[PDB]
Amino acid sequence: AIELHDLKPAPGAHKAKTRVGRGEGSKGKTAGRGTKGTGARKNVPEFFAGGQMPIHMQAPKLGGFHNPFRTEYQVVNLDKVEALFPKGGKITVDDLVSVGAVRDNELVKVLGTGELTVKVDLVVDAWSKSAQEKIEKAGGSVTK
Amino acid sequence: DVRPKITLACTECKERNYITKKNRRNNPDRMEMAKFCPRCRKHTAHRETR
Amino acid sequence: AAVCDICAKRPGFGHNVPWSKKKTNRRWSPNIQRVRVVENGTHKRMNVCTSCLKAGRVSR
Amino acid sequence: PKMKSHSGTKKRFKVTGSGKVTARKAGKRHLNEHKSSRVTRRLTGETVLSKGEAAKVKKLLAGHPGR
RNA sequence: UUGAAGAAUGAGCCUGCGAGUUAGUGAUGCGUGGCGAGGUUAACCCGUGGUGGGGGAGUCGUAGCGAAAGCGAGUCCGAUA
RNA sequence: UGAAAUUGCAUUACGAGUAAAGAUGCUCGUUACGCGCAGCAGGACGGAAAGACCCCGGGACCUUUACUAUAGUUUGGUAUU
Ligand SMILES: CON(C)Cc1ccc(O)c2c1C[C@H]1C[C@H]3[C@H](N(C)C)C(O)=C(C(N)=O)C(=O)[C@@]3(O)C(O)=C1C2=O
Ligand SMILES: [Mg+2]
Ligand SMILES: [Mg+2]
Ligand SMILES: [Mg+2]
Ligand SMILES: [Mg+2]
Ligand SMILES: [Mg+2]
Ligand SMILES: [Mg+2]
Ligand SMILES: [Mg+2]
Ligand SMILES: [Mg+2]
Ligand SMILES: [Mg+2]
Ligand SMILES: [Mg+2]
Ligand SMILES: [Mg+2]
Ligand SMILES: [Mg+2]
Ligand SMILES: [Mg+2]
Ligand SMILES: [Mg+2]
Ligand SMILES: [Mg+2]
Ligand SMILES: [Mg+2]
Ligand SMILES: [Mg+2]
Ligand SMILES: [Mg+2]
Ligand SMILES: [Mg+2]
Ligand SMILES: [Mg+2]
Ligand SMILES: [Mg+2]
Ligand SMILES: [Mg+2]
Ligand SMILES: [Mg+2]
Ligand SMILES: [Mg+2]
Ligand SMILES: [Mg+2]
Ligand SMILES: [Mg+2]
Ligand SMILES: [Mg+2]
Ligand SMILES: [Mg+2]
Ligand SMILES: [Mg+2]
Ligand SMILES: [Mg+2]
Ligand SMILES: [Mg+2]
Ligand SMILES: [Mg+2]
Ligand SMILES: [Mg+2]
Ligand SMILES: [Mg+2]
Ligand SMILES: [Mg+2]
Ligand SMILES: [Mg+2]
Ligand SMILES: [Zn+2]
Ligand SMILES: [Zn+2]
Numbered sequence: 001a002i003e004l005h006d007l008k009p010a011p012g013a014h015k016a017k018t019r020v021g022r023g024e025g026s027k028g029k030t031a032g033r034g035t036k037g038t039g040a041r042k043n044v045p046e047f048f049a050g051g052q053m054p055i056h057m058q059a060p061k062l063g064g065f066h067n068p069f070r071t072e073y074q075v076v077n078l079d080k081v082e083a084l085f086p087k088g089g090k091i092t093v094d095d096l097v098s099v100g101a102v103r104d105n106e107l108v109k110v111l112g113t114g115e116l117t118v119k120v121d122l123v124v125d126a127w128s129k130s131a132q133e134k135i136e137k138a139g140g141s142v143t144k
Numbered sequence: 145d146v147r148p149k150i151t152l153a154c155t156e157c158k159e160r161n162y163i164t165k166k167n168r169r170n171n172p173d174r175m176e177m178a179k180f181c182p183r184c185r186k187h188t189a190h191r192e193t194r
Numbered sequence: 195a196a197v198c199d200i201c202a203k204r205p206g207f208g209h210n211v212p213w214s215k216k217k218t219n220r221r222w223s224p225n226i227q228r229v230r231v232v233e234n235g236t237h238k239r240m241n242v243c244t245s246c247l248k249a250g251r252v253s254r
Numbered sequence: 255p256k257m258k259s260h261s262g263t264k265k266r267f268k269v270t271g272s273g274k275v276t277a278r279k280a281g282k283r284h285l286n287e288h289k290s291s292r293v294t295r296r297l298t299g300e301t302v303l304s305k306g307e308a309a310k311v312k313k314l315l316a317g318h319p320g321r
Numbered sequence: 322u323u324g325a326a327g328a329a330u331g332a333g334c335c336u337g338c339g340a341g342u343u344a345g346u347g348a349u350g351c352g353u354g355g356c357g358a359g360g361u362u363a364a365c366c367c368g369u370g371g372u373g374g375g376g377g378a379g380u381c382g383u384a385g386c387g388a389a390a391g392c393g394a395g396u397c398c399g400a401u402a
Numbered sequence: 403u404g405a406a407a408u409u410g411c412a413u414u415a416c417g418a419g420u421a422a423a424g425a426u427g428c429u430c431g432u433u434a435c436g437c438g439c440a441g442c443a444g445g446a447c448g449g450a451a452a453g454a455c456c457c458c459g460g461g462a463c464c465u466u467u468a469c470u471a472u473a474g475u476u477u478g479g480u481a482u483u
Contacts, residue, residue, distance in 0.1 A: 013353040020341055031341065046313050047260060055307055056262040056314060059277040062321045064388025075384060075393080101358060101383060111384080113394050128393055149287050163287045185400095216471050227482050244482055257347045271385055298398090316348055321388095325422060328447045333409045 073126060074106040078114030078134060081122075088118040097124070110142070152190040154181040162190060196223040198243035200251050229254060259316035267303075267311045268320040275308035275320075276300050 021031040033040050047054060076097055084100040085092055098104035108124045112131030119139040127135075127142045135142055146169065152162040162179055174192040181188040196205045203224040209217040225244040230237065231252055242252045268276050282289075282297040289297075303311060 010353055015352065027341095046310060047262075055277075055303075055310065056260060056266055058280055059266045060280055060283060061262075061265045062268065062278055062388080064321075067389060070389085073393095077384085077394085080383090103383070109393090111393060111395095113384090130393085165287070210472075212471060214470050218472060220472095225481065229482085247482075255345060255347065257345095259348095313348075322422100326425095326427075327422075328424075328445105329422090330452095331410095333411105 071107060073109035074102050076102055076108065076110050076124075078110075078112050078116040078131060080114075081110070081120060082114060082116055082118060085120060086118070089120045091121045091123065093123050094125075116140070150175065150192045152177060152179060153193050154179075154184060154188045155191050156188045157181060157183045159183050160193065166192075195226045195228070195241040197241065198224060198226060198246055199240045200242055200246045203243045203245070257316040259318040260314035263311055263314040264318050265321060267315070269312075269315075275303040275311050277303060 018027065020027040022028060030040070038044055047056060049055070080100075081089070081092065081097075085096075089096070094102070094104065094108045097108055102108050107126065109126040109128075110122055110124050110131050111128050112134050114134070116134050116138045120135065121141050121143065122135065123143040125144055132142055147165050147167055149163060150166050151160050152164065152175070153160045159181060161181055162177075166175055174194065177190045178187050179190040180186070181190070197203065203226075205224065206222040208220060208222060210220045211217055226241045227244060227247060228239055228241050229247065229252065231240045231242075231254055233253055240252065246252055266277055270276060277300070279297045279299050279301050282294060286294060
């Protein structure tokens with residue numbers, strides 16, 4: 001039984017639009033720009049530094065290259081594996097880590113910051129050495 | 145022009161390890177020095193490149 | 195002339211490109227030659243490009 | 255329309271995991287003979303920008319994460 | 322404008338008109354609302370009945386470090402320093 | 403019969419001062435009843451033209467053994483041969 005005339009926004013949700021150049025009791029006349037100069041009329045570009053050689057020219061170019069065929073490993077940690085499979089996840093898989101969170105349709109590398117008190121069989125794409133060591137120490141395994 | 149830049153390369157692994165300056169008129173010939181060669185991992189004789 | 199009466203080869207337009215790369219408009223005309231032809235039985239001149247003349251597409 | 259990122263900024267500046275802006279030290283490309291090994295060591299690192307310069311670089315990168 | 326009642330500028334007078342706008346699934350803050358380790362759809366399809374429903378392709382968050390191979394709570398320079 | 407440029411205003415003195423350094427308008431004094439008509443040009447830094455000199459920014463055109471180009475003229479190759 002609200003009725004359309006009882007709908008009001010939350011306080012502070014609709015800030016009033018500041019209207020500039022409408023009198024000297026507000027941002028009036030110069031409209032918050034001061035007097036004379038470039039800034040009195042347009043702007044100054046962010047790459048411009050006054051004629052001094054700008055930072056983006058004086059700094060040397062980071063060289064190197066990009067791997068055209070670089071693949072990025074979605075990474076899951078042993079903390080997360082333990083938390084999302086606490087009941088001793090017998091055989092975790094890519095689909096299971098995806099329904100938890102791994103951002104699927106990618107390679108699903110597992111890393112090893114954590115403890116992993118449970119036994120787990122990961123079956124993922126690649127793993128770190130410390131993660132593998134912790135997994136067999138707990139009694140689990142990795143595959144693929 | 146009278147004190148050129150000379151490059152010392154190790155006489156073992158022919159690696160241009162160092163660069164320095166001589167006098168050309170006070171030392172006309174190629175200079176011999178014992179410097180540390182990182183590749184050879186010891187002190188090897190270094191000779192000015194030709 | 196710069197248009198072939200056979201194959202209608204016509205000038206192309208591009209750039210003079212100096213060392214400083216100050217590009218200026220220029221033209222590439224086809225190598226048009228005016229030769230005597232005997233077509234069917236008609237003696238007449240025709241402006242014929244050297245490509246057509248070499249290919250033999252023109253009867254002399 | 256989408257805002258393009260500054261090309262020189264893309265090629266020259268990195269953004270770390272914690273939002274720091276870093277560049278490569280300047281002055282080591284050539285004329286290195288007269289420079290001591292100490293000077294070359296000072297110039298061979300990676301410098302962290304000041305707050306104002308980092309803000310300017312972040313504005314120049316149109317959300318580009320740096321090189 | 323350092324400084325103007327100024328013998329510096331503009332206005333004869335009234336009435337009307339006359340300048341911070343709008344567009345981006347732009348960039349970056351803040352307020353506020355929703356959901357929350359998740360958030361969100363674009364085109365398009367359906368609703369000839371709209372403002373509603375579908376659509377998760379993508380995209381941001383979910384790990385960083387390195388020129389990169391790569392390694393990974395570490396990584397890179399380095400001598401497994 | 404009937405305009406014009408001009409016009410922040412008005413109940414618009416002088417003297418010696420003072421002040422953006424040359425005041426009808428501020429100070430201290432002096433003089434002056436209200437309103438007209440014909441006149442004269444010392445002042446209102448009088449009106450008319452966003453100084454035409456100077457400098458600073460921009461432009462234009464002109465010049466040349468400034469730069470970079472180019473039509474034209476010329477050299478050779480090659481096609482037509
Ligand atoms: C001998 O030195 N005395 C003091 C000057 C002077 C004397 C007698 C004159 O007769 C004129 C001048 C000045 C010039 C100024 C010229 C100028 N122009 C050439 C760019 C200009 O700017 C305008 C204008 N319309 O603004 C002109 O009137 C103008 O052309 C012209 O005619 C002038 C004259 O008549
Ligand atoms: Mg004001
Ligand atoms: Mg005003
Ligand atoms: Mg302001
Ligand atoms: Mg202003
Ligand atoms: Mg102004
Ligand atoms: Mg100023
Ligand atoms: Mg200003
Ligand atoms: Mg600014
Ligand atoms: Mg721009
Ligand atoms: Mg300069
Ligand atoms: Mg052009
Ligand atoms: Mg031939
Ligand atoms: Mg180099
Ligand atoms: Mg050195
Ligand atoms: Mg002044
Ligand atoms: Mg005035
Ligand atoms: Mg006055
Ligand atoms: Mg003025
Ligand atoms: Mg006026
Ligand atoms: Mg007006
Ligand atoms: Mg997807
Ligand atoms: Mg005075
Ligand atoms: Mg006086
Ligand atoms: Mg007085
Ligand atoms: Mg008074
Ligand atoms: Mg009179
Ligand atoms: Mg009179
Ligand atoms: Mg007078
Ligand atoms: Mg005047
Ligand atoms: Mg002027
Ligand atoms: Mg004039
Ligand atoms: Mg004049
Ligand atoms: Mg000019
Ligand atoms: Mg003119
Ligand atoms: Mg010729
Ligand atoms: Mg010839
Ligand atoms: Zn050596
Ligand atoms: Zn032809």
